[PDB]
Design a protein around this ligand. Structure first.
Ligand code: CLA
Ligand code: CLA
Ligand code: CLA
Ligand SMILES: C=Cc1c(C)c2cc3nc(c4c5[nH]c(cc6nc(cc1[nH]2)C(C)=C6CC)c(C)c5C(=O)[C@@H]4C(=O)OC)[C@@H](CCC(=O)OC/C=C(\C)CCC[C@H](C)CCC[C@H](C)CCCC(C)C)[C@@H]3C
Ligand SMILES: CC(C)=CCC/C(C)=C/CC/C(C)=C/CC/C(C)=C/CC/C(C)=C/CC/C(C)=C/CC/C(C)=C/CC/C(C)=C/CC/C(C)=C/CC1=CC(=O)C(C)=C(C)C1=O
Ligand SMILES: CCCCCCCCCCCCCCCCCC(=O)OC[C@H](CO[C@@H]1O[C@H](CO)[C@H](O)[C@H](O)[C@H]1O)OC(=O)CCCCCCCCCCCCCCCCC
Ligand SMILES: CCCCCCCCCCCCCCCC(=O)OC[C@H](COP(=O)(O)OC[C@@H](O)CO)OC(=O)CCCCCCCCCCCCCCC
Ligand SMILES: CCCCCCCCCCCCCCCC(=O)OC[C@H](COP(=O)(O)OC[C@@H](O)CO)OC(=O)CCCCCCCCCCCCCCC
Ligand SMILES: CCCCCCCCCCCCCCCC(=O)OC[C@H](COP(=O)(O)OC[C@@H](O)CO)OC(=O)CCCCCCCCCCCCCCC
Ligand SMILES: CCCCCCCCCCCCCCCC(=O)OC[C@H](COP(=O)(O)OC[C@@H](O)CO)OC(=O)CCCCCCCCCCCCCCC
Ligand SMILES: CC1=C(/C=C/C(C)=C/C=C/C(C)=C/C=C/C=C(C)/C=C/C=C(C)/C=C/C2=C(C)CCCC2(C)C)C(C)(C)CCC1
Ligand SMILES: CC1=C(C)C(=O)C(CC[C@](C)(O)CCC[C@H](C)CCC[C@H](C)CCCC(C)C)=C(C)C1=O
Ligand SMILES: [Fe+2]
Lengths: 34, 73, 38, 78, 31, 309, 44, 31, 351, 35, 35
């Protein structure tokens, strides 16, 4: 219950961080005049 | 059953070849010689990769030409 | 001619299996006959 | 050693303190990544005005294996 | 008689499996 | 109780027959029997039919040089359009054959037969004490068949647009849709494909788990396997919810694809992303949709005869 | 040419809305699974 | 010749279907 | 003699590694995890990155990316150009030479995704085997998955290996897959091949079995609950089955004519159908990879060519295939440098 | 002679060995910490 | 062919009348349940 940096933490963060990065990238792409 | 249903037929060739089929189930203690097997497997994998890249033109070597033209040596 | 082999069973094939096999072979023949004849 | 339930972290204070200041950083990092023009340079995607070069007026073609690097460098105009 | 080989192939494919299955069924039904 | 009508009612309603009949049975039996008889006869020895109405007959009978794959029963002529063309309306039997009446006969009788089969399912379910919701499941294929065979011709305006009763006819049918309406990009066809693939997946995997669990436990043993295989613990822990999900997925998929075909009958379209990407200066950059559109354009140009003699 | 029209004010405004809606619903979707896994575990 | 073969194959399939429908072994295993 | 049982020796690093890997946690790592997780993670990441940023301007002459203005249906990870015949397209290979930008431009991301994904499928199968062994169940899921892995291997590796190069393999996308399907319909007459017919029958029969079994089980439940809803009248620890086999058997024996009388046989049939269908489809595509296509029906072609006044749906299909090929090869294969004048393009007006 | 492609191939061999060694060290260290 | 028309009409009318008079002869109460 106390320890952190477990398998679950790594597994969730690995798919969480890039998801946010790409969401920001796509939201920014939306506002391009082409 | 007694001795797996009585003894079987005996032939000269059977008696000659019996020693090669006697020690069934014998094993060594511990892991024996698995590390050597691992090393040999790694070497074989490296060799397979080398040949695969040579035949796929991903590893161009000076001597090899990699075409039908090599038949005219 | 030496000794009866203890490992000797007999094959069994119920009627449903026979019907399935006949259906399979006939359906495959129906599908493939036109291609075989061209 | 019991993989604390998600409810415990959901009500924690340090979790929120970290994440509410961390996630926005990632979002802004992505926004600046695709806004500053770093994406085009990094991944080689041409800009809308770089598709057709002055001397080329059609889709490119590699037509070469062992010199593909120079071919692509020439076609892209870089 | 067109594509005699095709006719022979079809006849064999229809007969051999059918005969095998029927013989098996008659053999087992005696049990 | 002993009246002739009572005896007939008891015989029709009896559950001791090898095949249950019922009143839906009394309706469906002659319809389906006539349909199959005419279908076999027309498939074997039917003469040519002018589908396009431009005096270019299309042969589809076995006797006229055809196989199982290439044979079919050609739909009615374009001249008849959407009119009702029974056997006694044609001037002569030869003209009736030339125009393509047996397609109309088969489609009508078969549609009535399938609807009454739907009814008989519920009837027998009720006569036995079962719950009545198998007809709802059967409605999906019935809806799709009714769409393809009746609603598309009504929207287009002729029975020549129906699906020919064959294999190569079905392939030509599909190709003509992909040429005209761009079905592949319609969301409802995507849902139908998803339904079919998911049904196959679920059938295979349910069979695997159930067969593995059954040892000389049915749901409490394999659930441990599934929960740790692909995560997703405590999803379908109730044996009834799982089978309901199985029954629900493909049925909804097929309902949506049938509704999509019906909507295409009135010709809205599939999606259309042609020339959706343009750079500066107004030039057009090709996407995969443009290649699909080129294929569709070639298909449509090939299909149309235009110059008909 | 290919620059973003919108300013960074909307960038932060949308970051706040799409960053505190995903960091609080990722544990709510997994809670059933983590609660049932322990029940499955240590049993068989 | 091809037409006769096709008709025979179809008739055989239908006959097997009919026999399975009407002459099946009783399902006394579970009933 | 000196007999021995199992695990009667000193512990070793292998024992500690095995003990840690096979624990009970939210995620089961296992030995297969070391091969499954990295490969699958990289495959998914590569697909997303390619669909978001990378383009195919220099390979196919297309624009496929969100950064270029493409939807979820049109974006894809395009295959490498036809010039790169069968190079594995490593970043350090002679083509890329270590440049990441040029590596992405030439199209090595497709090979990256494909290889890592294939190894991910292998890892997933090994994971299923490991779980089954751990919980002591027969591994039928292994075969059920052996079907789709076979289909993937065939389509995505064996078909291109027989053709000119990777250029003709599927591109990871929706519109790309539609283009692939139309391409086979045009060039191979893939719809007329018996193997795709058998696969279609298998898939449709699998869906039919799923639907019918669900409907029958849910419509024959036993009365073991006062509530109007039958879902809460059950617990996982039940002793008997929740539905009456006899009633369903009689119902389907009086409606259709033949009905199951064995649960094991029924669920095994469910397992059997789709696997056989997909295996036959895989064999068909393997055959097609060598241009061994069922296209001719030579008798019909000869008869049609003899006299124009003999038309079947087969001839119309052949003409449609000709149209597809002629009208699509212009832009589908840029490396051929094809320019068909409008005079020669097939059209129905000229028949 | 050692062509550049061969040098790149040997570098790839070294990198793969490094990755495998890293994974092995990770599992060993974690197992030792937990047991 | 008027005779064929007459025959078809007669057969269809007979069967439809049989069906209608079938479902109207107290259908709901002939069930295995008791209520
Ligand atoms: C991966 C490829 C793929 C896949 C999986 C599908 C999948 C599907 N397509 Mg699509 N399609 C594709 C590619 C694909 N398509 C392409 C490339 C094209 C263009 C060439 C099309 C063009 C296309 C069209 C134009 C149509 C489909 C339809 C369908 C559906 C057919 C099954 C169905 O709904 O019938 C449901 C079941 C039936 C129709 C059968 C009814 C059975 C009756 C009621 C009983 C018959 C009794 C029988 C005679 C007696 C038997 C007794 C005994 C002998 C056994 C399904 C969702 C169809 C659809 O959506 O249906 C509305 C449709 O109309 N597709
Ligand atoms: C009624 C219409 C119909 C139907 C039902 C089918 C049925 C089928 N066709 Mg199609 N076809 C049709 C008409 C039809 N065809 C027509 C008219 C044409 C035009 C010629 C085609 C052209 C065509 C082609 C070109 C191909 C098929 C193929 C197939 C088979 C697909 C097998 C499969 O699921 O592989 C798909 C499954 C996989 C590849 C497995 C991959 C699974 C991975 C591991 C999952 C990855 C994880 C993922 C990221 C997780 C995310 C999940 C998320 C989506 C929820 C199947 C038998 C294919 C086939 O099987 O050939 C061998 C094929 O290549 N057909
Ligand atoms: C288990 C996980 C795993 C697996 C199975 C793979 C598998 C693969 N990767 Mg991936 N990769 C991984 C993890 C993994 N990778 C990780 C963690 C990273 C991030 C660092 C990457 C980053 C990555 C990139 C960037 C690329 C790949 C590529 C590849 C492919 C080429 C393999 C190759 O030649 O590499 C090297 C493989 C070996 C060296 C085999 C091991 C053999 C050892 C070294 C034997 C040593 C014995 C002895 C010392 C040798 C003696 C000979 C000589 C030295 C004297 C292959 C499909 C490439 C590809 O195909 O993409 C298109 C590519 O471009 N991968
Ligand atoms: C559209 C077809 C289709 C899809 C997408 C699919 C998907 C899936 N089926 C699985 C399982 C199964 N499928 C089964 C039978 C079948 N599955 C079928 C058809 C499909 N099955 C069919 C027809 C059958 C009948 C034989 C069984 C029996 C199982 C399972 O046991 C398993 C399960 O439990 O599911 C619940 C899962 C495997 C997880 C995985 O990839 O491991 C991890 C591996 C990964 C992630 C590597 C894959 C990398 C890929 C190849 C690279 C491309 C990735 C991109 C996202 C591609 C996008 C392409 C665009 C067009 C969108 C996954 C949810
Ligand atoms: C002149 C004439 C005659 C014209 C005909 C022209 C012509 C086109 C002829 C047809 C040609 C023809 C046969 C073509 C098909 C050829 C073809 C493609 C063959 C594929 C063969 C093949 C080997 C494919 C591989 C995949 C394969 C094995 C598929 C199997 C398909 C299959 C049989 C699916 C099952 C179908 C089916 C209806 C199942 C229902 C099962 C059922 C009754 C369950 C009910 C039920 C449910 C319960 O829940 C419980 C509890 C019980 C108890 C119970 O019972
Ligand atoms: C079931 C297995 C499930 C697990 C499999 C998982 C995937 C395994 C990893 C991927 C392996 C990819 C291997 C690529 C090999 C390659 O591209 O070689 C490509 C090269 C051929 O290269 C070609 O050569 C031609 C002749 O000169 C021409 O020059 C072409 O231009 C040139 O590209 O082949 C090899 O070097 C290796 C050949 C031996 C391997 C054969 C594989 C099967 C071939 C089938 C052929 C059609 C049928
Ligand atoms: C050169 C010498 C000759 C070589 C050829 C020899 C051929 C021998 C015969 C091989 C085939 C035998 C087949 C037996 C057939 C048979 O009896 O199977 C029975 C078997 C099930 O057996 P059970 O497990 O119930 O057996 C229990 C025991 O008590 C024995 O019955 O089913 C299968 O394993 C798969 C069978 C094939 C698949 C059947 C279903 C799918 C195909 C049907 C598709 C219909 C069309 C649908 C679409 C329209
Ligand atoms: C929009 C999509 C169409 C509307 C949803 C229609 C759903 C019909 C499913 C039929 C499945 C075949 C019958 C299979 C069968 O026999 O089902 C049997 C199953 C048993 O229900 P119970 O007997 O527990 O219900 C007791 C009473 O409340 C009456 O249901 O019926 C349901 O539970 C339906 C529940 C609503 C389901 C809503 C699904 C919504 C999906 C949205 C996407
Ligand atoms: C009014 C409605 C009239 C419907 C008439 C049509 C009914 C179709 C009857 C299919 C019989 C298939 C043979 C089963 C042979 C047989 O005896 O099976 C018996 C089998 C049940 O066997 P058991 O459960 O007793 O077996 C237990 C095992 O352990 C072995 O003992 O039935 C099934 O498994 C489901 C069968 C569905 C299979 C459907 C196949 C459909 C194929 C259609 C081909 C059409 C070709 C057309 C050519 C032009
Ligand atoms: C030890 C590696 C540590 C991680 C490095 C960073 C990884 C992320 C890479 C992102 C792309 C950036 C470009 C890198 C690519 C790059 O810049 O390479 C460059 C490097 C040296 O090339 P040069 O630039 O010196 O070549 C220039 C000219 O001389 C060429 O003719 O190539 C190598 O020696 C191999 C490097 C492998 C790097 C990938 C590591 C993974 C290897 C495969 C592992 C397989 C495991 C299988 C297990 C069974
Ligand atoms: C670079 C690279 C790499 C790696 C990579 C990776 C690992 C990646 C990852 C990536 C990732 C991991 C990504 C992710 C993404 C995600 C996304 C992109 C998402 C999206 C989502 C969405 C879009 C949603 C939507 C929705 C929802 C669901 C909610 C509401 C509704 C809607 C529908 C709106 C390496 C170095 C190895 C090699 C080379 C290449
Ligand atoms: C008790 C305890 C637990 C339960 C625990 O998880 C950890 C963390 C170990 C590690 C960081 O996960 C090590 C992960 C490294 C791993 C070996 C790398 C190869 C395997 C996978 C790539 C890991 C990621 C899998 C995930 C994506 C499901 C420690 C230190 C503990 O004391
Ligand atoms: Fe079931």
């Amino acid at each position: 219950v106390y320890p952190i940096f477990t398998v679950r933490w790594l597994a969730i963060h690995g798919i969480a961080v890039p998801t946010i990065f790409f969401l920001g990238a796509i939201t920014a792409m939306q506002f391009i005049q082409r | 059953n007694s001795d797996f249903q009585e003894p079987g037929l005996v032939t000269p060739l059977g008696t000659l070849l019996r020693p090669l089929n006697s020690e069934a189930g014998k094993v060594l203690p511990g892991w024996g010689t698995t590390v050597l097997m691992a090393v040999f497997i790694l070497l074989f994998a490296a060799f397979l990769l080398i040949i695969l890249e040579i035949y796929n033109s991903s590893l161009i070597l000076d001597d090899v030409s990699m075409s039908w033209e090599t038949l005219a040596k | 001619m030496a000794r009866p082999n203890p490992n000797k069973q007999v094959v069994e094939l119920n009627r449903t299996s026979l019907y399935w096999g006949l259906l399979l072979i006939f359906v495959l023949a129906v599908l493939f006959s036109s291609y075989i004849f061209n | 050693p019991v993989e604390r339930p998600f409810s415990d972290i959901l009500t924690s204070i340090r979790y929120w303190v970290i994440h509410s200041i961390t996630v926005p950083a990632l979002f802004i990092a992505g926004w600046l990544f695709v806004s500053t023009g770093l994406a085009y340079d990094v991944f080689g995607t041409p800009r809308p005005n770089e598709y057709f070069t002055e001397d080329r007026q059609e889709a490119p073609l590699i037509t070469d294996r062992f010199n593909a690097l120079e071919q692509v460098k020439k076609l892209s105009g870089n | 008689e067109v594509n005699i080989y095709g006719l022979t192939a079809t006849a064999l494919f229809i007969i051999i499996p059918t005969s095998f299955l029927l013989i098996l069924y008659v053999k087992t039904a005696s049990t | 109780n002993s009246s002739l009508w009572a005896r007939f009612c008891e015989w029709i309603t009896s559950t001791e027959n090898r095949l249950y009949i019922g009143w839906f049975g009394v309706i469906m039996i002659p319809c389906l029997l006539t349909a199959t008889s005419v279908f076999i006869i027309a498939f074997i020895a039917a003469p040519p039919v002018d589908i396009d109405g431009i005096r270019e007959p299309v042969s589809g009978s076995l006797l006229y040089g055809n196989n199982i794959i290439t044979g079919a029963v050609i739909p009615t002529s374009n001249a008849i359009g959407l009119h009702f063309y029974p056997i006694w309306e044609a001037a002569s039997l030869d003209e009736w054959l030339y125009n393509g009446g047996p397609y109309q006969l088969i489609v009508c009788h078969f549609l009535l037969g399938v609807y009454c089969y739907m009814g008989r399912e519920w009837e027998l379910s009720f006569r036995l004490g079962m719950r009545p919701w198998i007809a709802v499941a059967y409605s999906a294929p019935v809806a799709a068949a009714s769409a393809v065979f009746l609603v598309y011709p009504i929207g287009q305006g002729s029975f020549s647009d129906g699906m020919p009763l064959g294999i190569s006819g079905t392939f030509n049918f599909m190709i003509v849709f992909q040429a005209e309406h761009n079905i592949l990009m319609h969301p409802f066809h995507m849902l139908g494909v998803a339904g079919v693939f998911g049904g196959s997946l679920f059938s295979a995997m349910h069979g695997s788990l159930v067969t593995s669990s059954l040892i000389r436990y049915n749901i409490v043993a394999a659930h441990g396997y599934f929960g740790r295989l692909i995560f997703q613990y405590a999803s379908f822990n109730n044996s009834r919810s799982l089978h309901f999900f199985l029954a629900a997925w493909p049925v909804i998929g097929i309902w949506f694809t049938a509704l999509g075909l019906s909507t295409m009958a009135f010709n809205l379209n599939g999606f259309n992303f042609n020339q959706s990407v343009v750079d500066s200066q107004g030039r057009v950059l090709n996407t995969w949709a443009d290649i699909i559109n080129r294929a569709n354009l070639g298909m449509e140009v090939m299909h149309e005869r235009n110059a008909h003699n | 040419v290919g620059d973003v029209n919108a300013p960074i004010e909307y960038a932060v405004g949308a970051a706040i809305l799409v960053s505190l809606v995903a960091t609080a619903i990722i544990p709510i979707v997994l809670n059933p699974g983590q609660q049932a896994a322990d029940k499955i575990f240590n049993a068989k | 010749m091809e037409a006769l073969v096709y008709t025979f194959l179809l008739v055989g399939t239908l006959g097997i279907i009919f026999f399975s429908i009407f002459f099946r072994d009783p399902p006394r295993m579970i009933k | 003699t000196i007999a021995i049982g199992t695990y009667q020796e000193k512990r070793t690093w292998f024992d500690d590694a095995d003990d840690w890997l096979r624990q009970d946690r939210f995620v089961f790592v296992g030995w297969s995890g070391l091969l499954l997780f990295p490969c699958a993670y990289f495959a998914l990441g590569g697909w997303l990155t390619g669909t978001t940023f990378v383009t195919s301007w220099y390979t196919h002459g297309l624009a496929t990316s969100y950064l270029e203005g493409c939807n979820f249906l049109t974006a894809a990870v395009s295959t490498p150009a036809n010039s790169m015949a069968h190079s594995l397209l490593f970043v350090w290979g002679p083509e890329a030479q270590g440049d990441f930008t040029r590596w992405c431009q030439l199209g090595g991301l497709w090979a990256f995704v494909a290889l890592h994904g294939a190894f991910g499928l292998i890892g997933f199968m090994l994971r299923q085997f490991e779980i089954a062994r751990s919980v002591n169940l027969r591994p039928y899921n292994a075969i059920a998955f052996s079907a789709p892995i076979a289909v993937f291997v065939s389509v995505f590796l064996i078909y291109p290996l027989g053709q000119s190069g990777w250029f003709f393999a599927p591109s990871f996308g929706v519109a790309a897959i539609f283009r692939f399907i139309l391409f086979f319909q045009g060039f191979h007459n893939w719809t007329l091949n018996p193997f795709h017919m058998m696969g279609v029958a298998g898939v449709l029969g699998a869906a039919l079995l799923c639907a019918i079994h669900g409907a029958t089980v849910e419509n024959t439940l036993f009365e073991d609950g006062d509530g109007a809803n039958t879902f809460r009248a059950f617990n996982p620890t039940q002793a008997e089955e929740t539905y009456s086999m006899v009633t369903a058997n009689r119902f389907w024996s009086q409606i259709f004519g033949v009905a199951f009388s064995n649960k094991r046989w029924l669920h095994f049939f469910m397992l059997l159908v789709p696997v056989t269908g997909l295996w036959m489809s895989a064999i068909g595509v393997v055959g097609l990879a060598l241009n061994l296509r069922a296209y001719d029906f030579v008798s019909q072609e000869i008869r049609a060519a003899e006299d124009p006044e003999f038309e079947t749906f087969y001839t119309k299909n052949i003409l449609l295939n000709e149209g597809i090929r002629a009208w699509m090869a212009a832009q589908d294969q840029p490396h051929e440098r094809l320019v068909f004048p409008e005079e020669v393009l097939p059209r129905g007006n000229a028949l | 002679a050692v062509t550049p492609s061969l040098k790149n191939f040997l570098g790839s061999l070294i990198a793969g060995a490094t990755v495998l060694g890293g994974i092995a060290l990770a599992i060993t260290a974690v197992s030792k910490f937990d047991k | 062919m008027l005779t064929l028309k007459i025959f078809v009409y007669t057969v269809v009318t007979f069967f439809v009348c049989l069906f209608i008079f079938g479902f109207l002869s107290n259908d709901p109460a002939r069930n295995p349940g008791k209520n």
